[PDB]
Amino acid sequence: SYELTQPPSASGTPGQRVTISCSGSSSNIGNNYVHWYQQLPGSAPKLLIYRNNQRPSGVPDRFSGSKSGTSGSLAISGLRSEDEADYYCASWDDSLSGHWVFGGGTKVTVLGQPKAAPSVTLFPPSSEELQANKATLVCLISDFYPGAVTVAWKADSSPVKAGVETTTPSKQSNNKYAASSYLSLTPEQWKSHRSYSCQVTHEGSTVEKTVAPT
Amino acid sequence: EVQLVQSGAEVKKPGASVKVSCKASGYTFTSGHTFPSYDINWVRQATGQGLEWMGWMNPNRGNTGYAQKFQGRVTMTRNTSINTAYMELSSLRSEDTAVYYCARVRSGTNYGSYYYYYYGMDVWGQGTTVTVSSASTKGPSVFPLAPSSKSTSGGTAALGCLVKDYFPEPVTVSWNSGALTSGVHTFPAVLQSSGLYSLSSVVTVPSSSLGTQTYICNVNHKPSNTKVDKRVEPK
């Protein structure tokens, strides 16, 4: 559990000012400092603001911080798409032996780009994998925006929830998102149905792909 | 310039212990009464979760302070002659699966027995993944994801490789030995209830080249010292 309180998520459109609160108590923020860390996707955290309002060398001044009482605030002025990241506040708590306390982190989403329906690609189990007595359906989902999708699997027309693994969406170089989903079956289950479908729902619209043993 | 470089990924069984190293460069690791004094702290993060403090170590005298959660199974040391700090975590449970970071912070001020920090963690190592699982290392089976007319749009075709049932992370996938980078996407891995990972790498190529160009995915799973090359063809 996290001993600082910050909102799990924040959002803004490019150019907007986004502020992130970080609430502590008198034994951390009250009598110490607030520092902030930015964690880009797939990256290590980096120091963004220290000692309430100081910017490390190389951090643009559109990032600012403040502290008041037992709480602090991170302000991201002139929000940019690359500001999409997790932001962590931190403080040194002096209760008993002293320990670093952290916020639970705030995911900032920057909504700056036009909507894009997903491209869906569904692969059936290969003959090789069937010969290995296994079967995996692979549903690749790319080029969607915003980065929220839900995946539903169908055997003929019945939902399938067992043996499903789907990855969290991540941003590609084309600034759109991608995800993947897996349906594990036995070869007999695969052959015992006329078709299987990967149904991807994005912003209230569903894109479907279907494969058949034959 | 200042850099913290950590040792490589680790895989361990429940009950084991792991020792992670962190080599500092770009500044003088110890003060010697002249250079600015910096401690090495350690912070870990399970995938999709927050930051969790483990402890601090002043490399000048080697004194330490550990978070209450890890007291009794953690040890932070350093070899000053090679600018390297170490973190050793014992009695590994699966909940210890996480990325372990070392981080630098200006040494605190002593108030008797009490340590006070007034600066942020200003440089972080690249992290080291520690995987704690009862699974044993296993190389992947690579299956082709063959393009058909169903995997084809306009003039482009999607083809790929399914990298199935390996442990632990990671695998890297290249295409045509690195020569093919455009249109290549390697997806994050899933962890199946078997404790084994799987992932896919896919390429979008012009459908016309399916009869003229060869496509090979090169799958490398260094933890098991396994390299697979698989040619993906249309039928």
Next chain:
Amino acid sequence: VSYSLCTAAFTFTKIPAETLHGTVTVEVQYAGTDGPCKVPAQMAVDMQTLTPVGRLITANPVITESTENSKMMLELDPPFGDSYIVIGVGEKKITHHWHRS
């Protein structure tokens, strides 16, 4: 303006010093940033009850800075005989045994 008690650790930065009046001056460094805040200061002979003895000469002893490691000085009027200078509260309080006269 109204100060709340300082919450972080103190530490003596010099040996407490007897004045010409038989009082004692102490200089303390303060670890917190919640300044300006009131320095907890008293004499005691019973270290488990901390019942006050003597008195404070300094009216309103305060840390004035809102940053760490600032130094302040205060003056106490110790009872005759043996007692303790006590700065701070809780497990972080610092003490110094004093003998007057």
